[PDB]
């Protein structure tokens, strides 16, 4: 459900999303596009686990 970024740590809240890099609310992590990124640290999506 929540993936934490193992590099800069950011919490990939996919329900809150990350609009700053086009990652929306309601969007799931296994649904967050490959070039979406954290509004805070923007750490690489693949740094996501759940």
Swiss-Prot record:
Signal peptide: none annotated. Residues 1-50 form the Rubredoxin-like domain. Binds 1 Fe(3+) ion per subunit. GO terms for molecular function: electron transfer activity; iron ion binding. InterPro entries: Rubredoxin, Rubredoxin-like_dom, Rubredoxin_dom, Rubredoxin_ET, Rubredoxin_Fe_BS. Extremely thermostable, being unaffected after incubation for 24 hours at 95 degrees Celsius. PROSITE patterns: RUBREDOXIN, RUBREDOXIN_LIKE. CDD domains: rubredoxin. Belongs to the rubredoxin family. This is Rubredoxin. It comes from Pyrococcus furiosus (strain ATCC 43587 / DSM 3638 / JCM 8422 / Vc1).
